Amino acid sequence: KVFGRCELAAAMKRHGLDNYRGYSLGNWVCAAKFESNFNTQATNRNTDGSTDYGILQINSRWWCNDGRTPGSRNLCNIPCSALLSSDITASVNCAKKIVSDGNGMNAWVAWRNRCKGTDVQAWIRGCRL
Ligand SMILES: [Cl-]
Ligand code: NA
Ligand SMILES: [Ru+3]
Numbered sequence: 001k002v003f004g005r006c007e008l009a010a011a012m013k014r015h016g017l018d019n020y021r022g023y024s025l026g027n028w029v030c031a032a033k034f035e036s037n038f039n040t041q042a043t044n045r046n047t048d049g050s051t052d053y054g055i056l057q058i059n060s061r062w063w064c065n066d067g068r069t070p071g072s073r074n075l076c077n078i079p080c081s082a083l084l085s086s087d088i089t090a091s092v093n094c095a096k097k098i099v100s101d102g103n104g105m106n107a108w109v110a111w112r113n114r115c116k117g118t119d120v121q122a123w124i125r126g127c128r129l
Pocket of ligand 2: 060061062063064065066069072073074
């Protein structure tokens, strides 16, 4: 599923991301835009052999199992394929785990380079919810 901007903002609000660890909704919508272009099916291989999965491009080195990332962990206890569904629950729940670890939203290089220190609230303006 390729989400619309306001559709994703509403779904992210529904599933608990607004103000999660002090990150207002716009942060999450902005990150998703530059990570996946709002595409739940997005995958991208990295030079280290891991892959990033889904609308928030969650990485197999630590967070999910894809059966091909040597020496990796599965801290969200999910197959990485679960992160590709139209239902964003697994991606949201796993992202909550990731952002609780120290660096906050800086784990998304896309967030640091494209969203941080910008008008992130702009990504949710004009939306119903
Ligand atoms: Cl990640
Ligand atoms: Na893994
Ligand atoms: Ru990451």
